[PDB]
Amino acid sequence: ANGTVMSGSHWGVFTATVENGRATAFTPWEKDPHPSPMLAGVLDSIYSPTRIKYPMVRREFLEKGVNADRSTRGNGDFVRVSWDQALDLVAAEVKRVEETYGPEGVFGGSYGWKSPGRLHNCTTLLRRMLTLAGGYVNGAGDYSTGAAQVIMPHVVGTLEVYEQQTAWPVLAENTEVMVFWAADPIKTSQIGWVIPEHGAYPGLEALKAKGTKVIVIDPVRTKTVEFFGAEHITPKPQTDVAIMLGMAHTLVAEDLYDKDFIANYTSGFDKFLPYLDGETDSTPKTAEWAEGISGVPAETIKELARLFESKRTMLAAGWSMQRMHHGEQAHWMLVTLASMLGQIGLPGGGFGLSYHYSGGGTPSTSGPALAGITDGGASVIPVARVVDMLENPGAEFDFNGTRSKFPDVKMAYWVGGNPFVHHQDRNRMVKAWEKLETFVVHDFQWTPTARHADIVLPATTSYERNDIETIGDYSNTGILAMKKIVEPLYEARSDYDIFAAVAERLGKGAEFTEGKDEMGWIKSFYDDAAKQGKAAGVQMPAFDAFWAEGIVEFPVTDGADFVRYASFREDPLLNPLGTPTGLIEIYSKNIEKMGYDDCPAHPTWMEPLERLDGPGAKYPLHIAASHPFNRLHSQLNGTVLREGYAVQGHEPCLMHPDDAAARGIADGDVVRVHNDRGQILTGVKVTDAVMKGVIQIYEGGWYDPSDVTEPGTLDKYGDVNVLSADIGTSKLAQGNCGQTVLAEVEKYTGPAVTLTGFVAPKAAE
Numbered sequence: 001a002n003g004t005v006m007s008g009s010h011w012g013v014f015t016a017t018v019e020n021g022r023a024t025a026f027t028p029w030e031k032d033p034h035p036s037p038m039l040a041g042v043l044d045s046i047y048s049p050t051r052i053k054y055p056m057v058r059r060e061f062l063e064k065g066v067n068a069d070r071s072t073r074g075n076g077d078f079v080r081v082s083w084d085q086a087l088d089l090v091a092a093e094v095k096r097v098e099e100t101y102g103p104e105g106v107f108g109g110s111y112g113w114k115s116p117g118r119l120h121n122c123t124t125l126l127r128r129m130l131t132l133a134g135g136y137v138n139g140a141g142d143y144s145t146g147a148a149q150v151i152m153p154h155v156v157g158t159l160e161v162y163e164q165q166t167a168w169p170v171l172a173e174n175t176e177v178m179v180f181w182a183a184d185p186i187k188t189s190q191i192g193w194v195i196p197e198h199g200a201y202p203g204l205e206a207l208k209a210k211g212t213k214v215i216v217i218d219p220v221r222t223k224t225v226e227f228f229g230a231e232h233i234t235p236k237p238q239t240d241v242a243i244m245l246g247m248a249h250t251l252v253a254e255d256l257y258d259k260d261f262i263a264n265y266t267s268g269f270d271k272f273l274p275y276l277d278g279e280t281d282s283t284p285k286t287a288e289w290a291e292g293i294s295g296v297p298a299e300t301i302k303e304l305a306r307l308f309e310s311k312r313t314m315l316a317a318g319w320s321m322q323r324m325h326h327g328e329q330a331h332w333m334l335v336t337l338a339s340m341l342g343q344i345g346l347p348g349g350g351f352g353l354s355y356h357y358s359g360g361g362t363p364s365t366s367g368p369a370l371a372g373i374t375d376g377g378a379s380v381i382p383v384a385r386v387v388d389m390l391e392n393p394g395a396e397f398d399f400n401g402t403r404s405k406f407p408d409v410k411m412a413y414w415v416g417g418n419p420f421v422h423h424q425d426r427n428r429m430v431k432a433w434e435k436l437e438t439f440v441v442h443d444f445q446w447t448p449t450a451r452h453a454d455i456v457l458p459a460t461t462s463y464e465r466n467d468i469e470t471i472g473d474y475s476n477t478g479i480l481a482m483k484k485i486v487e488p489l490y491e492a493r494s495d496y497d498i499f500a501a502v503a504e505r506l507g508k509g510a511e512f513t514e515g516k517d518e519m520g521w522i523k524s525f526y527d528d529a530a531k532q533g534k535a536a537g538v539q540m541p542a543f544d545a546f547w548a549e550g551i552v553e554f555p556v557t558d559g560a561d562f563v564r565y566a567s568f569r570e571d572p573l574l575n576p577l578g579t580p581t582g583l584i585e586i587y588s589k590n591i592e593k594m595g596y597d598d599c600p601a602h603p604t605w606m607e608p609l610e611r612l613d614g615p616g617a618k619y620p621l622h623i624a625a626s627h628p629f630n631r632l633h634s635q636l637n638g639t640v641l642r643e644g645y646a647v648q649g650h651e652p653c654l655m656h657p658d659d660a661a662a663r664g665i666a667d668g669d670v671v672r673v674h675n676d677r678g679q680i681l682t683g684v685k686v687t688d689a690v691m692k693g694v695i696q697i698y699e700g701g702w703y704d705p706s707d708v709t710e711p712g713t714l715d716k717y718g719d720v721n722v723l724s725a726d727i728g729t730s731k732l733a734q735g736n737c738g739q740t741v742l743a744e745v746e747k748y749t750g751p752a753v754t755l756t757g758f759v760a761p762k763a764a765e
């Protein structure tokens with residue numbers, strides 16, 4: 001095979017060059033306006049040293065099963081087995097747990113970003129097999145907008161975080177002031193959940209070309225700041241709600257806010273105002289009070305409030321500030337401030353929670369929806385409570401107004417996810433995993449999660465199979481044929497093939513496949529989309545002509561004029577919101593009735609577990625544990641891209657020159673970052689891009705424990721979740737709080753370390 005083949009991924013559409021059956025280059029689609037340099041690593045992930053070659057069973061589990069010593073999971077002592085042996089064992093273990101403990105004994109939430117593709121949807125496929133086996137405990141929500149997706153339905157009556165934004169071209173013609181509040185769109189627009197079109201890049205360029213005023217509110221001087229030469233505000237992390245309250249307070253005290261908008265489109269501002277004015281707690285939430293907490297000068301807070309009230313302003317917020325203790329307060333207070341400014345539903349004004357994610361704002365086409373394989377259908381937990389569940393079987397927990405009991409789980413099955421990187425408080429989690437009798441993982445790269453499994457099955461990538469998928473989570477630019485580029489490597493198999501074999505052994509083979517093969521499933525999804533298109537007046541070709549061209553693109557009709565909340569603004573009685581009042585709920589009677597101490601019935605400033613310069617806080621530096629520039633989470637850490645950012649081989653840590661100098665740390669030194677939960681190594685990069693008092697260690701580094709049998713073992717590489725706490729945002733959402741982290745840093749003076757996470761375990765070589 002010598003030629004080229006087009007396909008797609010979370011990073012975009014591309015064409016691969018193939019030479020004697022090997023992919024040798026991935027070249028960006030010629031219509032991609034701003035491709036990601038991460039494509040190089042996506043191609044490298046098919047072949048790197050951490051590619052999973054064969055099915056493996058952890059030696060202890062292979063010998064003793066349920067009586068295994070579980071304290072050694074992750075030490076790398078695996079045994080290679082055949083596919084028939086491994087498939088029989090997995091089917092036997094699913095059957096035994098289902099039969100002994102019921103569906104409540106199997107956890108199949110398998111949270112994860114996997115790969116796009118309507119057929120090869122590993123996590124849906126997992127749940128299709130588990131439903132056929134008798135059922136499972138699922139997870140609810142995500143780590144992404146854990147709090148925001150739960151509080152928004154109560155405030156604005158919709159999900160809001162994953163819904164279309166006022167279109168980019170509408171902003172270029174009407175916005176005078178664009179605010180990126182805890183958002184770094186240049187960084188986070190490189191990927192999509194479905195294939196990305198990178199629509200934010202022309203949208204950002206158009207704002208810059210129009211000369212629109214841009215303000216960034218973030219502890220780090222990011223590439224979004226640099227792109228625009230933006231006015232940059234640097235709040236101490238976790239204090240954005242105080243800043244917003246000081247802005248709101250200024251708008252009332254100077255008599256500037258939109259009283260008519262508040263009276264006509266909102267409910268409960270009259271119960272929020274006494275709090276804001278300090279009538280209930282003797283503490284007026286003034287700009288000065290906000291400076292005391294956040295460090296942002298009081299006069300700067302008042303001038304921004306003034307500026308925002310006097311100009312058509314769009315508040316484009318990102319999600320780091322809701323991935324923290326009391327995370328629900330951030331976007332609730334943001335909507336409350338935007339309601340006082342009175343521009344919601346006006347062209348170019350209001351707020352948007354998705355301008356930094358998967359092309360939100362890219363004009364939607366008139367094309368049809370594309371759907372794929374389905375799963376064939378307490379039993380559900382908030383996703384981030386998985387370790388609490390394992391440690392407290394039968395215990396009660398609160399979630400969004402209802403109380404339930406944790407199921408008693410004995411097996412976990414994970415595919416397309418990396419919990420030994422994404423979950424908070426690694427040391428606690430490692431100990432809690434000993435409650436599981438059996439842990440099964442599918443991946444194509446030797447992540448920490450695969451290293452810690454009892455049974456490891458090698459999955460294929462999307463580049464070794466055929467699939468179909470939309471281009472554009474919001475734009476619906478078109479539909480792509482994700483064509484097979486190379487044959488499956490080593491003994492890797494698709495998740496579909498693996499679960500069909502397991503289901504077959506359970507006597508449910510035919511039900512799992514539904515009588516179809518790979519192209520029979522794909523053609524069925526295509527034809528359904530084509531039927532809907534024909535009925536909508538969007539004619540598409542027949543499946544074989546579509547597949548030969550490789551893509552179908554759809555036309556934009558009125559999508560470039562979309563203004564979010566315009567129909568509500570234009571007539572709120574005719575087009576009410578989905579809340580109990582039909583209005584924006586600044587005070588929520590439904591939340592009040594829950595009686596949750598950590599989620600009051602209006603936006604409130606509350607002390608988090610720990611914050612930079614908080615009264616009595618133990619550790620001195622905040623860790624901006626944010627999304628990586630050159631990975632998708634942990635994805636691509638085991639590729640050639642790593643050498644472009646590693647420092648002495650470790651994950652990098654940005655540190656301000658003043659904080660480095662106080663510890664005698666030089667640029668490029670190996671340093672230990674530690675607190676009461678754990679300790680890791682990173683390689684420092686000294687730079688004033690991070691504000692003083694803050695260090696930046698991205699999430700996604702592959703945890704590489706020095707000795708898994710040692711409690712509190714040093715991580716040799718730099719997984720920042722060895723340092724996070726595992727607590728819920730509050731009882732409302734129970735979201736993860738992965739960015740509520742303080743720690744100390746010192747030049748490292750312990751034993752030298754050898755990195756073992758970027759080569760396969762010896763027996764799997």
Ligand SMILES: NC1=NC(=O)C2=N[C@H]3C(S)=C(S)[C@@H](COP(=O)(O)OP(=O)(O)OC[C@H]4O[C@@H](n5cnc6c(=O)[nH]c(N)nc65)[C@H](O)[C@@H]4O)O[C@H]3NC2=N1
Binds near residue numbers: 417
């Ligand atoms: N401290 C902290 N700060 C944060 O900001 C933070 N972010 C959180 C958020 S928002 C999220 S969304 C999570 C993400 O955590 P998530 O577990 O989703 O991270 P990924 O590195 O995308 O894991 C995806 C895995 O799927 C594998 N994979 C891809 N395709 C396939 C396939 O077809 N088959 C199989 N079997 N495997 C496949 C990949 O190789 C990869 O190992 O991390 C969360 N964790 C976080 N912690």
Ligand SMILES: NC1=NC(=O)C2=N[C@H]3C(S)=C(S)[C@@H](COP(=O)(O)OP(=O)(O)OC[C@H]4O[C@@H](n5cnc6c(=O)[nH]c(N)nc65)[C@H](O)[C@@H]4O)O[C@H]3NC2=N1
Binds near residue numbers: 218321357629
């Ligand atoms: N390149 C890339 N890699 C990814 O892993 C990736 N993940 C995707 C996912 S699953 C999601 S959920 C989104 C994440 O989108 P999200 O907006 O949650 O991204 P983060 O990088 O966690 O934070 C964005 C900015 O918040 C700033 N920040 C941190 N703490 C604070 C604070 O207290 N206050 C303020 N004002 N700013 C703060 C950080 O400095 C960072 O620049 O990105 C998506 N896009 C992604 N792109």
Ligand SMILES: [Mo+6]
Binds near residue numbers: 142143144145
């Ligand atoms: Mo996310």
